[PDB]
Motif scaffolding. Sequence first.
Motif, PDB file in Angstrom:
ATOM      1  N   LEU A   1      57.245  30.651  10.375  1.00  0.00           N
ATOM      2  CA  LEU A   1      57.787  29.496  11.081  1.00  0.00           C
ATOM      3  C   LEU A   1      58.636  29.922  12.274  1.00  0.00           C
ATOM      4  N   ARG A   2      59.366  31.034  12.143  1.00  0.00           N
ATOM      5  CA  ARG A   2      60.150  31.533  13.268  1.00  0.00           C
ATOM      6  C   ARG A   2      59.253  31.902  14.441  1.00  0.00           C
ATOM      7  N   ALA A   3      58.117  32.547  14.163  1.00  0.00           N
ATOM      8  CA  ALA A   3      57.174  32.867  15.228  1.00  0.00           C
ATOM      9  C   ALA A   3      56.615  31.599  15.862  1.00  0.00           C
ATOM     10  N   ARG A   4      56.397  30.558  15.056  1.00  0.00           N
ATOM     11  CA  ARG A   4      55.927  29.290  15.603  1.00  0.00           C
ATOM     12  C   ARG A   4      56.967  28.675  16.531  1.00  0.00           C
ATOM     13  N   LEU A   5      58.248  28.781  16.169  1.00  0.00           N
ATOM     14  CA  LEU A   5      59.302  28.272  17.041  1.00  0.00           C
ATOM     15  C   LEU A   5      59.330  29.012  18.370  1.00  0.00           C
ATOM     16  N   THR A   6      58.983  30.301  18.369  1.00  0.00           N
ATOM     17  CA  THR A   6      58.914  31.046  19.622  1.00  0.00           C
ATOM     18  C   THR A   6      57.883  30.437  20.562  1.00  0.00           C
ATOM     19  N   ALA A   7      56.712  30.075  20.036  1.00  0.00           N
ATOM     20  CA  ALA A   7      55.712  29.403  20.857  1.00  0.00           C
ATOM     21  C   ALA A   7      56.206  28.037  21.315  1.00  0.00           C
ATOM     22  N   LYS A   8      56.862  27.292  20.424  1.00  0.00           N
ATOM     23  CA  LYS A   8      57.435  26.007  20.813  1.00  0.00           C
ATOM     24  C   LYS A   8      58.515  26.192  21.869  1.00  0.00           C
ATOM     25  N   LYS A   9      59.403  27.170  21.665  1.00  0.00           N
ATOM     26  CA  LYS A   9      60.418  27.463  22.670  1.00  0.00           C
ATOM     27  C   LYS A   9      59.781  27.947  23.966  1.00  0.00           C
ATOM     28  N   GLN A  10      58.769  28.812  23.863  1.00  0.00           N
ATOM     29  CA  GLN A  10      58.057  29.255  25.058  1.00  0.00           C
ATOM     30  C   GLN A  10      57.322  28.096  25.718  1.00  0.00           C
ATOM     31  N   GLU A  11      56.745  27.200  24.913  1.00  0.00           N
ATOM     32  CA  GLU A  11      56.094  26.019  25.470  1.00  0.00           C
ATOM     33  C   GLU A  11      57.094  25.159  26.232  1.00  0.00           C
ATOM     34  N   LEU A  12      58.240  24.865  25.611  1.00  0.00           N
ATOM     35  CA  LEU A  12      59.288  24.130  26.309  1.00  0.00           C
ATOM     36  C   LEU A  12      59.852  24.946  27.464  1.00  0.00           C
ATOM     37  N   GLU A  13      59.999  26.259  27.274  1.00  0.00           N
ATOM     38  CA  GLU A  13      60.455  27.114  28.363  1.00  0.00           C
ATOM     39  C   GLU A  13      59.445  27.130  29.504  1.00  0.00           C
ATOM     40  N   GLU A  14      58.152  27.084  29.176  1.00  0.00           N
ATOM     41  CA  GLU A  14      57.133  27.012  30.215  1.00  0.00           C
ATOM     42  C   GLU A  14      57.183  25.681  30.953  1.00  0.00           C
ATOM     43  N   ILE A  15      57.648  24.623  30.287  1.00  0.00           N
ATOM     44  CA  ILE A  15      57.772  23.326  30.945  1.00  0.00           C
ATOM     45  C   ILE A  15      58.846  23.381  32.024  1.00  0.00           C
ATOM     46  N   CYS A  16      60.035  23.879  31.673  1.00  0.00           N
ATOM     47  CA  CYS A  16      61.095  24.016  32.665  1.00  0.00           C
ATOM     48  C   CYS A  16      60.687  24.980  33.772  1.00  0.00           C
ATOM     49  N   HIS A  17      60.056  26.098  33.406  1.00  0.00           N
ATOM     50  CA  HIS A  17      59.557  27.024  34.417  1.00  0.00           C
ATOM     51  C   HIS A  17      58.495  26.361  35.287  1.00  0.00           C
ATOM     52  N   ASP A  18      57.556  25.645  34.666  1.00  0.00           N
ATOM     53  CA  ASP A  18      56.562  24.910  35.438  1.00  0.00           C
ATOM     54  C   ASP A  18      57.209  23.780  36.229  1.00  0.00           C
TER      55      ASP A  18
ATOM     56  N   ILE B   1      66.756  22.432  29.858  1.00  0.00           N
ATOM     57  CA  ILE B   1      66.425  22.747  31.244  1.00  0.00           C
ATOM     58  C   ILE B   1      65.229  21.922  31.703  1.00  0.00           C
ATOM     59  N   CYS B   2      64.172  21.882  30.888  1.00  0.00           N
ATOM     60  CA  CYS B   2      63.011  21.067  31.234  1.00  0.00           C
ATOM     61  C   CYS B   2      63.370  19.587  31.264  1.00  0.00           C
ATOM     62  N   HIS B   3      64.176  19.134  30.301  1.00  0.00           N
ATOM     63  CA  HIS B   3      64.638  17.749  30.315  1.00  0.00           C
ATOM     64  C   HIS B   3      65.489  17.476  31.548  1.00  0.00           C
ATOM     65  N   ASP B   4      66.454  18.353  31.827  1.00  0.00           N
ATOM     66  CA  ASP B   4      67.252  18.209  33.039  1.00  0.00           C
ATOM     67  C   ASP B   4      66.388  18.371  34.283  1.00  0.00           C
ATOM     68  N   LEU B   5      65.389  19.256  34.222  1.00  0.00           N
ATOM     69  CA  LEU B   5      64.477  19.413  35.348  1.00  0.00           C
ATOM     70  C   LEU B   5      63.660  18.150  35.582  1.00  0.00           C
ATOM     71  N   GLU B   6      63.393  17.383  34.523  1.00  0.00           N
ATOM     72  CA  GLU B   6      62.680  16.119  34.687  1.00  0.00           C
ATOM     73  C   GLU B   6      63.442  15.185  35.618  1.00  0.00           C
ATOM     74  N   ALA B   7      64.756  15.063  35.412  1.00  0.00           N
ATOM     75  CA  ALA B   7      65.571  14.266  36.322  1.00  0.00           C
ATOM     76  C   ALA B   7      65.554  14.854  37.727  1.00  0.00           C
ATOM     77  N   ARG B   8      65.617  16.184  37.832  1.00  0.00           N
ATOM     78  CA  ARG B   8      65.517  16.824  39.139  1.00  0.00           C
ATOM     79  C   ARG B   8      64.135  16.615  39.746  1.00  0.00           C
ATOM     80  N   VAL B   9      63.082  16.768  38.942  1.00  0.00           N
ATOM     81  CA  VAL B   9      61.733  16.503  39.433  1.00  0.00           C
ATOM     82  C   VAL B   9      61.567  15.021  39.745  1.00  0.00           C
ATOM     83  N   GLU B  10      62.163  14.152  38.925  1.00  0.00           N
ATOM     84  CA  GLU B  10      62.100  12.721  39.200  1.00  0.00           C
ATOM     85  C   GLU B  10      62.949  12.356  40.410  1.00  0.00           C
TER      86      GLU B  10
END
Lengths: 49, 49
Positions: free
Chosen positions: A20-37, B34-43
Amino acid sequence: LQLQEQLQAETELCAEAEELRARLTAKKQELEEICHDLEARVEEEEERC
Amino acid sequence: LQLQEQLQAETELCAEAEELRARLTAKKQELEEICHDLEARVEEEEERC
């Protein structure tokens, strides 16, 4: 037998927590990829602006 | 006796995995914020368009 039974449930927690911890890494990376994207969107939006 | 020492290690080992797994939520929340806050920045950037 009691320690083995308790260890089995405890050992499953480590295997489940690790799996489950490894799964959270993908979830965190997924959310981290959102902010990065989204960061590129801010630069793209700012550049487009 | 070995199971007792091993069981205590599993509880401590799984605790680190559970703590590390739980810590991912706080770390993921940092990136998620960051992604949530970036949403407001992107918005707000798109709103400027």
